[PDB]
Design a protein around this ligand. Structure first.
Ligand SMILES: [Cl-]
Ligand code: NA
Length: 129
């Protein structure tokens, strides 16, 4: 599923991400825009052979099981394919665990490079929330 901007904001808000660990909604929508272009089916492969999955591009190296990343961990205890669903619940529950692990949203390279220190509120402007 390819989300609309305000559609995704509302979905995220309903799932408890607004201000989660101090990160306003605009931060999450910005990250999702640049990580996946709002597409739940996005996948990308890394040089070490791990793969990133879904709307927030969560990495099989630490967070999910895809059966082909030898020596990896599965800290959200889910199959990586669950992160590709049109229902974003699994992606969101796993993201909450990632952003809590000490490094906040810096775990998302596109957030660090393209959202951090910008006017992220602009990403939810106009939306009915
Ligand atoms: Cl933080
Ligand atoms: Na894994």
């Amino acid at each position: 599923k390819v989300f609309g901007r305000c559609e995704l904001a509302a979905a995220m808000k309903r799932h408890g991400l607004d201000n989660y660990r101090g990160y306003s909604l605009g931060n999450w929508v910005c990250a999702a825009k640049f990580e996946s272009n709002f597409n739940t089916q996005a996948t990308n492969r890394n040089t070490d052979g791990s793969t990133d999955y879904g709307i927030l591009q969560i990495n099989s190296r630490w967070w999910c099981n895809d059966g082909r990343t030898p020596g990896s961990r599965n800290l959200c205890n889910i199959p990586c394919s669950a992160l590709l669903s049109s229902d974003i619940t699994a992606s969101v529950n796993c993201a909450k665990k990632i952003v809590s692990d000490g490094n906040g949203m810096n775990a998302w390279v596109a957030w660090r490079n393209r959202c951090k220190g910008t006017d992220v509120q602009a990403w939810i402007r106009g939306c009915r929330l």
